[PDB]
């Protein structure tokens, strides 16, 4: 079905004509708009007091990346390159080799945060929950080179944010 948005004709009785003439000569709808703006003036503003107040976020939020560890301290990443394969933006670079104890571990794990589109495919494709997109979003830098993270930086991020990362993954892992 459909409806007409503008198809009505005004009534031509003398009362209606006088009302329209009064609206023309006395700016009734203009004063009505003034009243609406005044009502908003006396309402309460919706502004939060940043940086002392922060907007709501969810466990699913995708912010800065991090590399996680098992409770033993061992790295979760096994250098399987599934994140590198799935990355839409080709922002992950990975190189691996057997460790001194024979483990399958990475020697290079880079993420270009200026190429990353923060889509979260890498943490969907990770089979061991190693790479995650943490809750941090305030990490703007002063030089471009500081945004080209490497393995040491990502492990530092994981160590700094592990508590919150663990809590978010616990909250949201039953939807996955």
């Amino acid at each position: 079905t459909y409806k007409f948005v503008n198809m009505r004709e005004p009534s031509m009785d003398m009362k209606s004509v006088t009302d329209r003439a009064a609206q023309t000569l006395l700016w009734t709808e203009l004063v009505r708009g003034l009243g609406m703006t005044l009502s908003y003036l006396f309402r309460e503003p919706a502004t939060i007091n940043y940086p002392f107040e922060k907007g709501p976020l969810s466990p699913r939020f995708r912010g800065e990346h991090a590399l996680r560890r098992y409770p033993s301290g061992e790295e979760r990443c096994i250098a399987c390159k599934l994140c590198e394969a799935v990355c839409p933006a080709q922002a992950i670079t990975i190189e691996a080799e057997p460790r001194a104890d024979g483990s399958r571990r990475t020697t290079r794990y880079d993420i270009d945060m200026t190429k990353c589109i923060y889509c979260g495919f890498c943490q969907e494709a990770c089979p061991v929950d190693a790479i995650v997109e943490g809750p941090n979003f305030e990490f703007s830098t002063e030089t471009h080179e500081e945004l080209l993270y490497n393995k040491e930086k990502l492990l530092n991020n994981g160590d700094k944010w592990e508590a919150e990362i663990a809590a978010n993954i616990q909250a949201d892992y039953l939807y996955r």
Partner: protein, 70 residues
């Protein structure tokens, strides 16, 4: 809330008080504590000139009366 607009309006009002009050005070200061004489016409100007002449101090606002006629 909306009452945080008031201090700016208060400052602007305080700024707008200064010109008029200053003009009134300076008018009374330079005219012997009285209103500055309005001379919109030649008659009023001639009255001011005569007041200057009779004062003896070359100031129209120094008013003289019966103690001066006798």
């Amino acid at each position: 809330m909306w009452f945080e607009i008031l201090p700016g309006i208060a400052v602007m009002a305080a700024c707008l008080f200064i010109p008029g009050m200053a003009t009134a005070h300076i008018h009374k200061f330079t005219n012997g504590g009285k209103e500055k004489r309005v001379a919109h016409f030649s008659y009023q100007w001639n009255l001011m000139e005569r007041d200057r002449c009779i004062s003896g101090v070359n100031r129209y606002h120094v008013t003289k009366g019966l103690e001066n006629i006798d």
